[PDB]
């Protein structure tokens, strides 16, 4: 899960 | 030639155009993996993850050129401030690879992990949907206990070593960014600085969570005791009337929600079933119907329709035995007017309410689409979840279920349907707050180093027993990693957002119903057909993350912080009725009684009436006013 966040750009599906 | 602020305007516009293009591309790759699970798609998704995280590293490095104390324009200063966060990139190229591999290994262990019938090795069951089917629908203490223990010893034990290493690396990353520990890093989401009276410090969050939890505790005590008495009616020899509920008998794999217990706990089952699942199947609703109905709910309050792209592109059902999908309800904002929802919609009230929740996410996204890139976000991790939850608060009311033909036209409100409804809601909403607080406090304690590794599981179950009133049916040594048996733990998601969300939503529902001119208790409110309330909501939604969550909250509800007051008012009739119900029962739980070590075949006693006389006296004195 790609996000518009710098701290957390990518989150595990 | 050019001042820092003009330089920064230029930099941010370059960043925004490239970031929009790249983010849309990467999100398309993510969509491909989540709808079509293939290695070709994993490879593309991972490649895009590299491109994207590396891009944000470069742009974060570039954003440090422009000092924040040389910036007048606030819209510029906020963007730069967000960009100046180092994130997890601070680690070495070696350790970053190791932590990424750990995260992937844990996520794969969770999603691929399967337990097989001991008598039939060739036939196995995955967590989704095979094991969940049991933990939701089974009534067998032994089948449920098998599934629960099996999952925690087959896949949990695989996760223990990885989680230990993961904690070490996460804490290295957090301290390298001048947080105390990874838990403090996570609490950083709720941080506010430089907004004068709207500031909020990271340690302040724990204080507010625990202070608000206090007032949840009595209601939870009483709901838990009523649920205990009802679960005794269904598992006769396996529950003590003074003990924590066994973990495997709670409605899902963890007791994260007590929602599926409703069929057993229904107060007045003679009255029509407020769970419209049965009605949903007698009316042959498919998934398309569920989402169209939700759309109608949003248009009714003056919000827009779903885009042509939404109906074209969304995957609203499980796509068949051929191609596997990630069946986790999610709302997709990819930019360029592209909004989707991925949900493997089942014909149940659970997915009806979820559909409303996830479409509420799409409303928040569509509202703040006009904001600059990094500010196209909620005011904190709990805001999106609260937005989703209030929609289900309206959708779940019997009033509303009647107006959409799930409850018959000759459906009368009464005391008993009101109690039915409040009990069900509390099963979903109150039952998860101790679960969530306990889990997150365990994690926070682990990351701060208050819990050594020799006492990971010991303390996990101490805290389940104490905070939640749930007891393991099987003793668990440190080879177990029970917390990582939940997705949010092994896939590296913060979890306190569900507690904060849960308070926000009622705070929101209060304010909106005032805007809707609702006379009546907060739990009979349905905001449908009120553009006035929809307007009041949209004003906050289009803001996005343009201003901090203290102010974003205050603008709608009038307070700068989390409030538990509305939540108690929502459930007050049920609090009264539950207290009356428990009048002759016990309330609370012993931390010491356990399924495996609480049984005693009462062959011979020592006193005439055992201690029951003393127990009556001691309980009289115990609850004395
Ligand atoms: C919101 O308003 C709509 C439009 O009036 C309601 O839909 C009507 O409901 C009545 C019953 O009250 C039916 O007799 C009509 O046939 C319905 N018309 C349409 C076009 O749907 C809807 O029930 C209202 N919902 C709420 C929650 O107030
Ligand atoms: C801040 O910059 C934006 C463009 O990035 C501009 O539209 C806006 O007017 C500026 N605000 C102020 C107060 O100058
Ligand atoms: C880390 O972030 C700070 C500001 O948050 C920045 O000054 C620094 O250059 C970054 N990188 C480090 C400390 O290596
Ligand atoms: C939403 O779509 C309906 C048709 O399904 C249309 O009548 C209505 O005007 C639309 N609302 C908005 C706000 O575009
Ligand atoms: Cl557990
Ligand atoms: Zn959601």
XYZ file of C-alpha atoms and ligand atoms in Angstrom:
710
model
C 0.000 0.000 0.000
C 1.709 3.115 -1.314
C 0.853 6.301 0.560
C 1.360 10.054 0.349
C 3.561 9.956 3.447
C 7.282 10.550 3.887
C 7.677 8.682 7.182
C 5.699 5.675 5.891
C 5.879 5.576 2.076
C 5.117 1.855 1.782
C 2.915 -0.410 3.906
C 2.685 -4.189 3.649
C -0.388 -5.473 1.835
C 18.361 36.325 -6.955
C 15.706 34.070 -5.530
C 14.898 34.021 -1.817
C 14.488 30.764 0.112
C 10.704 31.070 -0.012
C 10.653 31.483 -3.808
C 13.206 28.672 -4.154
C 10.926 26.571 -1.952
C 7.815 27.339 -4.005
C 9.742 26.139 -7.064
C 11.039 23.033 -5.271
C 7.604 22.060 -3.969
C 5.989 22.399 -7.390
C 8.685 20.209 -8.978
C 8.192 17.724 -6.129
C 4.404 17.746 -6.497
C 4.312 17.130 -10.250
C 6.853 14.295 -10.089
C 5.315 12.846 -6.912
C 1.827 12.796 -8.426
C 3.044 11.027 -11.569
C 5.143 8.499 -9.639
C 2.537 7.898 -6.924
C -0.145 7.171 -9.510
C 2.172 4.700 -11.259
C 3.138 2.960 -8.006
C -0.483 2.793 -6.852
C -1.397 1.100 -10.132
C 1.266 -1.519 -9.391
C -0.163 -1.982 -5.879
C -3.666 -2.381 -7.313
C -2.348 -5.064 -9.655
C -0.820 -7.074 -6.809
C -3.888 -6.742 -4.583
C -6.323 -7.842 -7.312
C -3.957 -10.266 -9.106
C -1.471 -12.052 -6.829
C 1.335 -13.230 -9.131
C 5.115 -13.008 -8.934
C 5.135 -10.806 -12.032
C 2.926 -8.449 -10.012
C 5.011 -8.793 -6.806
C 8.123 -7.940 -8.828
C 6.492 -4.857 -10.339
C 5.120 -3.735 -6.960
C 8.510 -4.145 -5.259
C 10.278 -2.295 -8.083
C 7.831 0.587 -7.677
C 8.304 0.509 -3.908
C 12.016 1.010 -4.523
C 11.445 3.852 -7.006
C 9.002 5.565 -4.628
C 10.771 5.226 -1.271
C 14.053 6.252 -2.920
C 12.301 9.255 -4.498
C 11.046 10.350 -1.093
C 14.545 9.893 0.353
C 15.948 12.235 -2.294
C 13.178 14.797 -1.859
C 13.478 14.692 1.937
C 17.213 15.315 1.571
C 16.521 18.168 -0.858
C 13.892 19.708 1.439
C 16.481 20.300 4.174
C 18.043 23.082 2.077
C 15.161 25.421 2.945
C 15.040 26.448 6.632
C 11.585 26.580 8.179
C 12.335 29.813 10.075
C 12.857 31.575 6.723
C 9.387 30.706 5.379
C 6.400 33.050 5.636
C 3.829 31.158 3.529
C 2.290 28.531 5.813
C 1.159 26.193 3.024
C 4.832 26.078 2.000
C 6.107 25.611 5.564
C 3.831 22.624 6.260
C 4.821 20.812 3.062
C 8.509 21.392 3.779
C 8.038 20.255 7.389
C 6.471 16.993 6.221
C 9.245 16.527 3.654
C 11.969 17.126 6.260
C 11.013 13.978 8.193
C 13.758 11.393 7.755
C 11.581 8.309 8.238
C 13.039 4.805 8.209
C 15.578 5.791 5.530
C 18.096 6.794 8.229
C 19.431 3.236 8.503
C 22.387 1.868 6.566
C 21.840 0.254 3.173
C 22.554 -3.108 4.849
C 20.218 -2.817 7.841
C 17.466 -1.275 5.701
C 17.572 -4.340 3.442
C 17.479 -6.624 6.488
C 14.458 -4.876 8.036
C 12.609 -4.819 4.702
C 13.251 -8.547 4.284
C 11.998 -9.170 7.836
C 8.798 -7.232 7.151
C 8.220 -9.175 3.928
C 9.032 -12.509 5.585
C 6.563 -11.872 8.418
C 3.834 -10.718 6.030
C 4.317 -13.799 3.840
C 4.331 -16.102 6.880
C 0.996 -14.582 7.908
C -0.709 -14.670 4.507
C 0.608 -18.063 3.326
C 0.421 -19.790 6.724
C -1.884 -22.808 6.870
C -2.765 -25.401 9.519
C -3.817 -28.892 8.488
C -6.165 -31.428 10.028
C -3.977 -33.666 12.239
C -5.805 -36.733 10.909
C -5.685 -35.452 7.293
C -2.354 -33.806 6.396
C -3.184 -33.375 2.694
C -6.187 -31.130 3.434
C -5.132 -27.845 5.046
C -6.832 -24.574 6.001
C -5.592 -20.996 5.633
C -6.482 -18.143 7.963
C -8.449 -16.496 5.149
C -11.099 -17.761 4.831
C -10.828 -21.279 6.258
C -9.818 -20.594 9.856
C -11.902 -17.411 10.103
C -14.929 -19.459 9.020
C -14.468 -21.548 12.168
C -13.660 -18.724 14.583
C -16.769 -16.883 13.336
C -19.328 -19.672 12.936
C -18.254 -22.669 15.030
C -19.965 -23.457 18.329
C -17.605 -26.318 19.246
C -15.230 -25.524 22.111
C -12.804 -28.144 20.774
C -12.922 -27.160 17.074
C -12.535 -23.477 17.972
C -9.748 -24.258 20.444
C -7.991 -26.354 17.805
C -8.069 -23.520 15.275
C -6.969 -20.898 17.821
C -4.085 -22.939 19.283
C -3.102 -24.283 15.853
C -2.767 -20.817 14.366
C -0.784 -19.592 17.374
C 1.649 -22.552 17.424
C 2.065 -23.140 13.666
C 2.398 -19.562 12.361
C 2.949 -17.631 15.581
C 6.032 -19.608 16.571
C 7.441 -18.994 13.086
C 7.011 -15.268 13.742
C 8.621 -15.004 17.215
C 12.307 -14.750 16.098
C 11.464 -12.386 13.258
C 9.494 -10.133 15.601
C 12.362 -9.967 18.101
C 14.766 -8.893 15.345
C 12.097 -6.542 13.964
C 11.719 -4.791 17.323
C 15.485 -4.303 17.580
C 15.741 -2.775 14.099
C 12.648 -0.591 14.541
C 14.027 0.798 17.795
C 17.395 1.502 16.153
C 15.505 3.465 13.499
C 13.396 5.344 16.060
C 16.309 6.415 18.266
C 18.322 7.440 15.195
C 15.455 9.884 14.541
C 15.569 11.147 18.145
C 12.532 9.274 19.470
C 12.845 7.152 22.610
C 11.640 3.950 20.918
C 9.495 2.751 18.031
C 6.354 3.225 20.124
C 7.257 6.888 20.596
C 7.831 7.068 16.835
C 4.266 5.830 16.285
C 2.828 8.210 18.881
C 4.451 10.953 16.802
C 1.421 10.828 14.487
C -0.632 12.637 17.138
C 2.088 15.266 17.679
C 1.442 18.984 17.156
C 4.035 21.773 17.328
C 3.921 25.524 16.826
C 0.137 25.970 16.750
C 0.114 27.704 20.192
C -2.809 26.275 22.210
C -3.401 23.404 19.776
C -0.087 21.682 20.546
C 0.027 18.036 21.631
C 3.047 16.109 22.932
C 3.714 12.431 22.302
C 3.557 11.356 25.945
C 0.276 13.256 26.334
C -1.393 10.636 24.113
C -0.780 7.753 26.533
C -2.191 9.816 29.400
C -5.327 10.692 27.438
C -5.812 7.110 26.198
C -5.604 5.704 29.726
C -7.660 8.495 31.328
C -10.417 7.990 28.750
C -10.188 4.195 29.138
C -10.981 4.520 32.853
C -14.520 5.664 32.069
C -14.935 2.871 29.505
C -14.019 0.328 32.203
C -17.381 0.154 34.097
C -19.477 -0.281 30.947
C -16.987 -2.883 29.722
C -17.109 -4.700 33.070
C -20.867 -5.006 32.836
C -20.982 -5.925 29.136
C -18.265 -8.524 29.768
C -20.171 -10.037 32.700
C -23.402 -10.244 30.689
C -21.488 -11.823 27.795
C -19.929 -14.266 30.273
C -23.338 -15.306 31.576
C -24.537 -15.752 27.990
C -21.475 -17.749 26.908
C -22.090 -20.047 29.874
C -25.533 -20.709 28.358
C -23.642 -22.065 25.301
C -20.380 -23.580 26.665
C -21.689 -25.059 29.918
C -18.616 -26.617 31.593
C -15.956 -24.403 30.006
C -16.620 -20.973 31.568
C -16.477 -20.037 35.256
C -18.939 -17.306 36.336
C -16.048 -15.272 37.840
C -13.356 -15.639 35.187
C -12.048 -14.168 31.969
C -13.713 -15.417 28.795
C -11.608 -18.053 26.986
C -9.849 -16.414 24.058
C -11.044 -18.931 21.461
C -14.787 -18.376 22.121
C -15.014 -14.684 21.229
C -16.211 -14.323 17.602
C -13.018 -13.935 15.576
C -9.522 -15.377 15.770
C -8.458 -12.959 18.540
C -11.521 -11.480 20.193
C -10.707 -8.233 18.395
C -14.466 -7.750 17.982
C -17.306 -9.464 19.844
C -19.551 -8.920 16.815
C -20.286 -12.554 15.930
C -21.309 -13.266 19.543
C -24.563 -11.355 18.940
C -26.515 -14.457 17.890
C -25.673 -15.941 21.296
C -25.964 -12.721 23.304
C -29.140 -11.276 21.711
C -31.187 -9.843 24.630
C -34.656 -10.050 23.095
C -34.406 -12.532 20.245
C -38.158 -12.685 19.724
C -38.183 -9.141 18.332
C -37.108 -8.800 14.670
C -33.430 -9.388 13.964
C -31.659 -6.016 13.810
C -28.819 -7.923 12.123
C -30.121 -7.645 8.561
C -27.831 -10.359 7.172
C -30.769 -12.770 7.044
C -32.936 -10.053 5.503
C -30.107 -9.255 3.076
C -30.212 -12.833 1.792
C -34.016 -13.071 1.583
C -33.869 -9.934 -0.598
C -31.062 -11.382 -2.780
C -28.769 -8.389 -2.367
C -25.523 -8.768 -4.283
C -22.434 -6.618 -3.704
C -23.391 -4.084 -6.386
C -26.607 -3.417 -4.457
C -24.712 -2.894 -1.195
C -22.428 -0.270 -2.710
C -25.184 1.494 -4.670
C -27.177 1.768 -1.427
C -24.162 3.336 0.311
C -23.753 5.794 -2.572
C -27.377 6.820 -2.105
C -26.688 7.392 1.588
C -23.900 9.804 0.720
C -25.846 11.693 -1.953
C -28.694 12.131 0.548
C -26.486 14.374 2.718
C -25.355 16.562 -0.200
C -22.140 14.668 -1.023
C -21.177 13.646 -4.584
C -21.743 10.411 -6.482
C -18.967 7.924 -7.059
C -16.927 8.619 -10.178
C -17.316 6.707 -13.426
C -13.824 5.456 -12.664
C -15.016 4.060 -9.340
C -17.685 1.827 -10.870
C -15.435 0.890 -13.798
C -12.318 0.013 -11.832
C -13.328 -1.113 -8.329
C -13.147 -4.806 -7.429
C -16.258 -5.245 -5.291
C -16.269 -9.076 -5.155
C -13.789 -11.929 -4.736
C -12.585 -12.449 -8.325
C -12.874 -16.236 -8.520
C -10.981 -19.449 -7.901
C -8.505 -18.611 -10.684
C -7.003 -15.289 -9.570
C -6.385 -14.660 -5.869
C -6.823 -11.253 -4.254
C -6.004 -9.533 -0.970
C -9.473 -9.487 0.603
C -8.843 -6.656 3.057
C -11.391 -3.807 2.724
C -9.418 -0.806 1.473
C -10.162 2.500 -0.261
C -7.743 3.654 -2.964
C -6.813 7.277 -3.709
C -4.300 7.201 -6.559
C -4.476 10.801 -7.758
C -5.617 12.038 -11.164
C -9.261 11.693 -10.143
C -8.747 7.961 -9.582
C -10.687 6.504 -6.635
C -11.355 2.795 -6.096
C -12.501 0.364 -3.420
C -11.096 -3.140 -2.976
C -13.436 -5.314 -0.921
C -14.345 -8.987 -1.327
C -17.924 -8.145 -0.445
C -19.953 -10.871 1.252
C -23.734 -10.578 1.665
C -23.703 -9.849 5.398
C -24.481 -6.814 7.543
C -20.767 -6.722 8.358
C -19.928 -5.967 4.730
C -22.906 -3.598 4.426
C -21.495 -1.496 7.258
C -17.958 -1.888 5.906
C -19.099 -0.714 2.458
C -20.411 2.445 4.103
C -17.126 2.824 6.058
C -14.823 2.427 3.061
C -17.015 4.710 0.879
C -16.675 7.298 3.664
C -12.926 7.013 3.150
C -13.526 7.729 -0.558
C -15.576 10.799 0.393
C -12.733 12.132 2.560
C -10.271 11.543 -0.294
C -12.461 13.162 -2.956
C -13.038 16.130 -0.650
C -9.364 16.882 -0.022
C -8.167 16.000 -3.553
C -7.592 19.736 -4.192
C -4.965 20.020 -1.433
C -1.223 19.804 -2.175
C 0.219 16.306 -2.393
C 1.516 15.673 1.126
C -1.555 17.343 2.669
C -3.945 14.975 0.837
C -4.236 13.037 4.088
C -6.296 12.817 7.240
C -5.463 14.989 10.221
C -4.127 11.861 11.990
C -4.272 8.072 11.732
C -7.613 7.981 13.558
C -9.465 10.563 11.463
C -10.076 8.383 8.390
C -11.281 5.478 10.551
C -13.597 7.824 12.509
C -15.028 9.192 9.248
C -15.770 5.643 8.172
C -17.291 4.683 11.529
C -19.865 7.487 11.756
C -21.384 6.385 8.426
C -21.962 2.908 9.875
C -23.385 4.561 12.987
C -26.128 5.995 10.804
C -26.428 2.953 8.516
C -26.866 0.529 11.422
C -29.832 2.260 13.068
C -33.142 0.335 12.801
C -34.694 3.569 11.515
C -32.322 3.509 8.552
C -32.491 -0.252 7.950
C -36.265 0.208 7.808
C -36.104 3.106 5.358
C -34.082 0.899 2.960
C -36.431 -2.100 3.178
C -34.238 -4.384 5.268
C -36.716 -4.107 8.147
C -40.405 -4.435 7.317
C -42.679 -1.377 6.938
C -44.608 -2.541 10.022
C -41.471 -2.377 12.188
C -42.078 -0.604 15.499
C -39.332 0.841 17.652
C -39.596 -0.257 21.273
C -37.548 -0.679 24.440
C -36.416 -4.156 23.416
C -35.247 -3.396 19.872
C -33.371 -0.414 21.314
C -31.610 -2.699 23.801
C -30.944 -5.269 21.044
C -29.341 -2.603 18.857
C -27.230 -1.072 21.617
C -25.953 -4.510 22.673
C -24.915 -5.347 19.102
C -23.169 -2.017 18.599
C -21.377 -2.384 21.951
C -20.257 -5.865 20.910
C -18.562 -4.287 17.916
C -17.500 -0.943 19.398
C -16.943 -1.285 23.148
C -15.629 -4.853 22.946
C -12.682 -3.774 20.787
C -11.483 -0.878 22.978
C -9.921 -2.986 25.785
C -8.529 -5.304 23.100
C -6.904 -2.397 21.260
C -5.615 -0.586 24.351
C -4.139 -3.814 25.744
C -2.425 -4.733 22.464
C -0.961 -1.272 21.896
C 0.163 -0.926 25.514
C 1.913 -4.302 25.240
C 3.695 -3.117 22.093
C 4.589 0.258 23.624
C 6.029 -1.534 26.654
C 8.021 -3.930 24.458
C 9.533 -1.102 22.415
C 10.448 0.910 25.527
C 12.160 -2.171 26.970
C 9.845 -2.544 29.963
C 9.144 -6.155 28.908
C 12.199 -8.439 28.458
C 12.039 -11.324 25.999
C 11.884 -14.014 28.699
C 8.519 -12.451 29.654
C 7.003 -11.519 26.284
C 4.169 -14.070 26.357
C 3.929 -14.210 30.150
C 3.197 -10.483 30.223
C 1.048 -10.577 27.070
C -1.355 -12.945 28.793
C -1.079 -11.189 32.160
C -2.302 -8.102 30.307
C -5.035 -9.953 28.403
C -6.272 -11.361 31.730
C -6.073 -7.999 33.503
C -7.153 -5.368 30.954
C -9.407 -7.400 28.661
C -10.778 -10.097 30.908
C -9.775 -12.750 28.357
C -7.734 -15.825 29.329
C -5.756 -18.197 27.126
C -7.106 -21.781 27.024
C -3.572 -23.187 26.614
C -0.371 -22.080 28.403
C 2.072 -20.318 26.082
C 5.846 -20.331 26.552
C 8.171 -17.862 24.839
C 8.311 -19.934 21.639
C 4.922 -18.324 20.933
C 4.414 -14.910 19.385
C 0.690 -14.528 19.964
C 0.532 -10.752 19.179
C 1.975 -11.345 15.698
C -0.872 -13.776 14.963
C -2.810 -10.588 14.109
C -2.175 -8.871 10.773
C -1.690 -5.376 12.188
C 1.207 -6.602 14.341
C 3.180 -8.664 11.815
C 2.563 -6.189 8.960
C 3.782 -3.165 10.976
C 0.631 -1.084 11.445
C 0.020 1.158 14.410
C -3.036 -0.010 16.306
C -4.010 2.752 18.759
C -5.753 4.494 15.842
C -8.763 2.241 16.412
C -9.120 3.405 20.012
C -8.740 7.095 19.130
C -11.064 6.668 16.140
C -13.669 5.069 18.385
C -13.868 8.119 20.601
C -13.698 10.622 17.722
C -16.620 9.065 15.880
C -19.109 9.657 18.667
C -17.768 13.176 19.160
C -18.402 13.591 15.437
C -21.842 11.956 15.502
C -22.937 14.291 18.287
C -21.899 17.435 16.416
C -23.407 16.311 13.115
C -26.771 15.382 14.649
C -27.000 18.836 16.208
C -26.370 20.083 12.669
C -29.159 17.726 11.564
C -31.553 19.017 14.282
C -31.793 15.552 15.861
C -34.079 15.507 18.882
C -33.722 12.168 20.621
C -30.899 10.056 22.033
C -27.672 10.058 20.030
C -28.153 6.364 19.169
C -31.396 6.983 17.263
C -29.629 9.532 15.036
C -29.337 8.842 11.316
C -27.809 11.771 9.418
C -29.444 10.699 6.141
C -31.292 13.311 4.085
C -29.552 16.174 5.963
C -27.427 18.350 3.688
C -26.877 20.588 6.715
C -24.898 17.870 8.515
C -23.201 16.774 5.289
C -22.063 20.368 4.777
C -20.741 20.569 8.337
C -18.784 17.363 7.651
C -17.487 18.391 4.217
C -16.014 21.565 5.710
C -13.734 19.375 7.827
C -13.073 16.775 5.123
C -11.825 19.125 2.392
C -9.309 20.479 4.926
C -7.305 17.259 4.756
C -4.090 17.579 6.752
C -3.876 21.321 6.019
C -4.248 22.048 9.745
C -3.581 19.945 12.852
C -5.991 17.379 14.237
C -6.619 19.345 17.441
C -8.017 22.222 15.367
C -9.562 19.894 12.768
C -11.525 18.253 15.595
C -12.367 21.529 17.374
C -13.747 23.059 14.176
C -16.482 20.409 14.074
C -17.055 19.388 17.691
C -15.709 22.254 19.823
C -12.868 20.448 21.624
C -9.103 20.204 21.135
C -8.817 16.634 22.425
C -10.291 13.157 22.610
C -13.555 13.013 24.571
C -15.266 9.931 26.022
C -18.450 11.821 26.993
C -20.466 11.154 23.765
C -19.484 7.484 23.801
C -20.984 6.938 27.237
C -24.115 8.853 26.248
C -24.566 6.606 23.188
C -24.606 3.466 25.357
C -26.361 4.820 28.484
C -29.642 2.844 28.085
C -27.582 -0.307 27.652
C -25.454 0.574 30.690
C -28.605 0.833 32.819
C -30.127 -2.370 31.434
C -26.865 -4.324 31.835
C -26.408 -3.182 35.432
C -29.934 -4.387 36.177
C -29.201 -7.666 34.367
C -26.061 -8.340 36.415
C -27.714 -7.391 39.759
C -27.497 -10.998 41.064
C -24.431 -12.097 39.070
C -20.737 -11.383 39.623
C -19.031 -8.410 37.956
C -15.390 -8.244 36.961
C -13.148 -11.261 36.620
C -10.416 -13.232 38.332
C -7.088 -13.068 36.529
C -6.179 -16.507 37.909
C -8.944 -18.833 36.695
C -7.947 -20.456 33.404
C -9.550 -23.177 31.248
C -6.533 -25.455 31.737
C -6.004 -24.700 35.440
C -9.350 -23.607 36.895
C -11.416 -26.780 36.778
C -12.063 -28.716 39.972
C -14.392 -31.716 40.136
C -16.168 -30.937 43.423
C -16.057 -34.425 44.924
C -15.874 -33.309 48.581
C -16.183 -29.869 50.186
C -15.035 -28.629 53.584
C -17.800 -26.268 54.778
C -21.547 -26.724 55.084
C -22.501 -24.472 52.175
C -18.876 -24.023 50.990
C -17.965 -20.314 51.222
C -21.184 -19.171 49.472
C -22.445 -17.600 52.704
C -19.130 -15.767 53.127
C -19.115 -14.886 49.425
C -22.551 -13.293 49.741
C -21.404 -11.233 52.734
C -18.099 -10.244 51.126
C -19.745 -9.147 47.886
C -22.240 -7.060 49.878
C -19.362 -5.287 51.634
C -17.323 -5.232 48.408
C -19.737 -3.146 46.326
C -21.015 -1.112 49.287
C -21.636 2.591 48.710
C -34.758 10.121 2.451
O -35.654 10.697 1.495
C -36.082 9.799 0.460
C -36.925 10.609 -0.500
O -38.099 11.103 0.132
C -36.838 8.626 1.078
O -37.270 7.730 0.057
C -38.722 7.620 0.071
O -39.193 7.005 1.286
C -40.624 6.900 1.367
C -40.951 6.333 2.729
O -40.717 7.304 3.740
C -41.155 6.048 0.215
O -42.577 6.000 0.278
C -40.711 6.644 -1.114
O -41.108 5.809 -2.195
C -39.193 6.799 -1.139
N -38.761 7.392 -2.395
C -37.557 7.176 -2.931
C -37.296 7.842 -4.249
O -36.715 6.485 -2.373
C -35.951 7.926 2.100
O -36.679 6.897 2.761
C -35.438 8.925 3.142
N -34.539 8.265 4.076
C -34.332 8.687 5.328
C -33.381 7.866 6.146
O -34.884 9.686 5.779
C 1.436 30.370 -0.736
O 1.868 29.775 -1.980
C 0.791 29.377 -2.839
C 1.409 28.657 -4.015
O 2.208 27.564 -3.585
C -0.008 30.609 -3.242
O -1.082 30.228 -4.095
C -0.545 31.300 -1.996
O -1.185 32.515 -2.366
C 0.592 31.621 -1.022
N 0.063 32.173 0.215
C 0.413 33.369 0.702
C -0.233 33.765 1.995
O 1.218 34.098 0.126
C 17.475 13.860 9.918
O 16.476 14.866 10.099
C 16.961 16.143 10.528
C 15.738 17.000 10.749
O 14.608 16.195 11.056
C 17.904 16.715 9.477
O 18.448 17.933 9.971
C 19.043 15.744 9.196
O 19.842 16.230 8.123
C 18.511 14.337 8.868
N 19.605 13.386 8.654
C 20.558 12.986 9.524
C 20.520 13.550 10.923
O 21.421 12.180 9.189
C -25.953 11.404 -8.538
O -26.514 10.536 -9.509
C -27.939 10.615 -9.658
C -28.340 9.547 -10.653
O -28.001 8.257 -10.166
C -28.319 12.018 -10.108
O -29.732 12.119 -10.267
C -27.799 13.044 -9.111
O -28.047 14.345 -9.629
C -26.295 12.875 -8.884
N -25.838 13.776 -7.836
C -24.789 14.592 -7.980
C -24.459 15.444 -6.800
O -24.137 14.643 -9.024
Cl -3.883 -13.848 21.185
Zn -11.461 1.658 6.922
